[PDB]
């Protein structure tokens, strides 16, 4: 139940994600991400792109059907008024790419949490262009303490939940449509 590990998919829940948050300690902005793979395919880590912030965790390399990966991120350490924003990319054994955006801002006077999930045709690494697509162009979900569902095409669908504060949990389930 640590970031960088995989757990049985059925075990994923907000308690495990709070555990992940608690392990990062006293930092101002941080995120715990759990993504439950119920897609019928194996996922292999590609990379994480950070627009800002960092993780000390390696993406779980192999995520079999029926497993959830756990991951985390935090703001850059130090007197920088910035949050943690980035895109995770996994390659799926059908030849496509699962991409996940998470965005936790510094200033909640003016900005809000967001996330997004998309499947890309072919093998595509996470990068600043992918961030811009996920954030500006592909209808991200607000981290509004609510669940959101969307078909992903490719026979899959996504259902996820993110809270609205600067200690963020993001729980996503990828299932057969
Ligand atoms: Cl915003
Ligand atoms: N601080």
Residue numbers in the entry: 3 to 179
From the paper:
Actinoporins are classified as α-helical PFT (α-PFT) because the transmembrane pore is predicted to form an α-helical barrel. The lytic activity of actinoporins on biological membranes is enhanced by the lipid sphingomyelin (SM) and by lipid-phase coexistence. Here we reveal structures of FraC corresponding to four different stages of its activation route, namely the water-soluble form, the lipid-bound form, an assembly intermediate and the transmembrane pore.
In the monomeric form of FraC, the side chain of Phe16 is inserted in a hydrophobic cavity of the β-core region.
